[PDB]
Amino acid sequence: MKIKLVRSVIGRPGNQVKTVQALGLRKIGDSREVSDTPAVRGMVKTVKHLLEVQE
Amino acid sequence: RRKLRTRRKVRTTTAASGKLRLSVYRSSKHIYAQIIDDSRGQTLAAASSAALKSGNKTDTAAAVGKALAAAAAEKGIKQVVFDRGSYKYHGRVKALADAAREGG
Amino acid sequence: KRTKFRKQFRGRMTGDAKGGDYVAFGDYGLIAMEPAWIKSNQIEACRIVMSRHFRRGGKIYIRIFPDKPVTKKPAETRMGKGKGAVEYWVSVVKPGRVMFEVAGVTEEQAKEAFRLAGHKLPIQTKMVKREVYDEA
Amino acid sequence: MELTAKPRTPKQKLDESMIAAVAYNKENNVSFALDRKAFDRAFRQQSTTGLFDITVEGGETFPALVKAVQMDKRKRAPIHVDFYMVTYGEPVEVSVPVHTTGRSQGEVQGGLVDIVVHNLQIVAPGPRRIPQELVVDVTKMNIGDHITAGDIKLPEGCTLAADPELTVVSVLPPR
RNA sequence: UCACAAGGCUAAAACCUUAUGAAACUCCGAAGGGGCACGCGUUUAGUCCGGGAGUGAGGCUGCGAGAGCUAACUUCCGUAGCCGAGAGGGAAACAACCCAGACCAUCAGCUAAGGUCCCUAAAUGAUCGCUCAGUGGUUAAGGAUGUGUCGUCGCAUAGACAGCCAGGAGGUUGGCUUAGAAGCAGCCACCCUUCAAAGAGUGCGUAAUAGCUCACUGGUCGAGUGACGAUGCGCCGAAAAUGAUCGGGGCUCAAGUGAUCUACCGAAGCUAUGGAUUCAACUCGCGAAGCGAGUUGUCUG
RNA sequence: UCCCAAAAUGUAACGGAGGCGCCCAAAGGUCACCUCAAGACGGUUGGAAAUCGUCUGUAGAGCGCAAAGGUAGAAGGUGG
RNA sequence: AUCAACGGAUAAAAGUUACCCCGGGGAUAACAGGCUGAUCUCCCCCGAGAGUCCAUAUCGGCGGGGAGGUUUGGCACCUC
RNA sequence: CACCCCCGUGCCCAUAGCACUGUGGAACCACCCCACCCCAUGCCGAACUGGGUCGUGAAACACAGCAGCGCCAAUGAUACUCGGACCGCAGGGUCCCGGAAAAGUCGGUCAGCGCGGGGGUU
């Protein structure tokens, strides 16, 4: 799937941060692609509301 | 009541001791002494008495206890642990013992 | 009113009312709307109220009951040294839960005796009639 | 009666005013949803011994007695119904409201007509000829007489699941 | 197990139907939470050994509970974030709140929360509506033919709710009660005579009478009315001390509020360009390391 | 020891109950054996309860003391 | 070894100061204000009876809803 | 285990339990018989136990019938809830998206799998 960061990290839980980190997004505006597999897509369920996502 | 039988049955720590369970049924005038690996749900010896005993009654003890221990020594089963059930260990089943206690 | 013997003390919490939201014992029944507390006298109130109205004498079912010890410290001390002695007793009435059932009177008597009853309480209230049939 | 839907998602209804649903034949069981209006109408018309027909928006009329209702305890309206699709000859253990008949002589000396069991769990007439109510004459009762489940009547071909000595409608003293 | 609502029944205890409360009840019992493994797919940290510390007064909101009075800018734990140690926009003003983490430069562009009549950047925008109260712009039980929406119930082309017309009757001062109550101060009961219709009746009344109106009944008129709930938004209830007000101006010919769409403004976050440092990898020279340099990626409250 | 303690351990309060500073020479080791509280009927003193008897009987008892967890195939009761 | 103030200062120990001194604290009380509103103050609803009769001319049980911030307090936030 | 069936024994720890009930005797079980000593009773062959039958199928045990009780238990729906958002001064409540019982109803069931032995199928 296709990821973009639009809402920041500040004021948000330890885990949701650490997922935004260990997804690879380091600042808003950031874009990315992702292996449509469980674990790493369930790393985009978890922090969904921070990412506008494509398909 | 049952109590005694299930009591000894558990003081034969089922398989964990390693050895071989040795049943009995001296509550009738037809007995049944058996040999079990209990873990494996199988029986490995078998000295009955219902296919003609001898003629004796509680003298038969040492005899089916000699027949059992014989079928044992034949099988290869060289080690004992003595189950019972509702039994005192003193007379009849004690004979079965003594003559199994040196009989295979 | 009060109870007989017990534990002594308490605390508090809320979220909707278990049972029994159904019209047993009576034809007509009055039902809470707010997550109140209710007191010994607060109910003995409605006892004596409705029991005025019905005359001799109706049939009146107080489906609620005070079991909660509520305290107040001695007036005028700074906190600490204890928990308050038991001030009064409370039935923890939650909403939809039904407090009063009566029959042996008519519709008008239910309306009015329940009106006068509910003008004695910390809650808006609705009166109604049976049909809640999961178990009579 | 008549439904249209049967999914798991209820936005097809609710606001548009329909009730969550089940109805089992006992070899056939089906979830669905039925408009509030009609259900309330008929269910007070016909109630827990009512029996009525299910012409699903497909074309397959069915035979339905009402089994369990489950409602919004706060708003005090119903949100769900369990059905029992009737069979043929043998039915179930019908629940039926005891009534009272006649100007009783029990209420002339200060007493009161009290139904110590508003509803009665019988057994089987046959699922097409069911008693809706019951009629327990009370006139003979004075003050202090109860009516056990023996004295309760019958319409023929029915049995009483209830202990024949426990108290249904008994007169109470004044005050 | 302690509690407890009605009723059965017996001599009440038990026990049956009906029925409910629990931090120190538990036939049952999630959501989550934790250990281990795997890494099946991402990301960067971890752990040890040795040097230097400081801190050990915490504070607020949100969710959990306790002590309190379901008081506190209250206190004592837990838990997330924030300030502490956080600038920038917003919330008029405002450590904590909503957006957001400021390496320098720019008279450059897009957005977030939050906004777009003037103060004050940006639609006095578009369409379907609501409220008329300045509600908006500070509270409640309780009360209201306010005004829109859905739904129940009843009534009449067999004459309706209301307007006016006439009976609103004899038993019977019903009995009880009483100084007298005779429709009407309190206690059990509501039966008959006829009728186009009329009930020991409902109010004002009399110390008690009598006496005046309705429940029903018929003439008229010409048609809808009447009640019991749900609900959107408003009204009353709404009284404190120096000068008033929503930040103000002012707005209802919305600048109020419910819905749906789209355009623009807005930050030190994102973006353009230019440059600097931090780390790292690459290339080069002297002599592995090592320095400066250069390029790329990176980092800097 | 028990709640409070937010289903992992942990966690404060001058929050909510209660207990210890011993006891045991057998109440320990082993071996063997026994089963409990109650209710119903029926029974000399008794007769609410004592003793015996039978039917019921997974814990509604017992564990030296506090409760929770635990326990009937014994940790409970009796002897070598 | 009630070193039980129970990680235990000496082998060994009590008061008083309004004669009082120094060092600090708004880390902490009395004053005021503040936030809170239990108590205090007042107003509203329901009406059970009182008023020969008649709840409401006046009066208003048992109970409910609020105001106000003048009481005694709680809290210890600016000032020791 | 060749077919039934009984004796001993296990995996399974009530969809495998209990009561009501019918079958069951030389073929195993059981009762029964006696016990001066082995051996045993806090007294008693009741029990542990030594001698051995007939006798009985009664009791106990085994089998089968059986849904009255217990046991088990759906789907639907709900409570609560992770995480997204929000309203009310507040007691508390809502919306989106997932996880999701308890109890009740439909029902389901007289368990199911082994090893060895004895004993029968003119």
Ligand SMILES: CC(=O)[C@H]1O[C@@H](OC2=CCC(/C=C(\C)C(=O)N[C@@H]3[C@H](O)[C@@H](O)[C@H]4OCO[C@H]4[C@@H]3O)=CC2=O)[C@@H](O)[C@@H]1O
């Ligand atoms: C001059 C000082 O000491 C300094 O301390 C600070 O002031 C004050 C200190 C104490 C105080 C009041 C005390 C002790 C009191 O107990 N006061 C009660 C009562 O409340 C009061 O109202 C009176 O009423 C009946 O008699 C009185 C009665 O003794 C008032 C002050 O203002 C500071 O501002 C000053 O400079």
Ligand SMILES: [Mg+2]
């Ligand atoms: Mg169950």
Ligand SMILES: [Mg+2]
């Ligand atoms: Mg310290």
Ligand SMILES: [Mg+2]
């Ligand atoms: Mg802290």
Ligand SMILES: [Mg+2]
């Ligand atoms: Mg503090």
Ligand SMILES: [Mg+2]
């Ligand atoms: Mg600091």
Ligand SMILES: [Mg+2]
């Ligand atoms: Mg700032």
Ligand SMILES: [Mg+2]
């Ligand atoms: Mg700011």
Ligand SMILES: [Mg+2]
């Ligand atoms: Mg500003």
Ligand SMILES: [Mg+2]
């Ligand atoms: Mg602040």
Ligand SMILES: [Mg+2]
């Ligand atoms: Mg926007």
Ligand SMILES: [Mg+2]
């Ligand atoms: Mg402008």
Ligand SMILES: [Mg+2]
């Ligand atoms: Mg560079």
Ligand SMILES: [Mg+2]
């Ligand atoms: Mg720095």
Ligand SMILES: [Mg+2]
């Ligand atoms: Mg936890």
Ligand SMILES: [Mg+2]
């Ligand atoms: Mg702590």
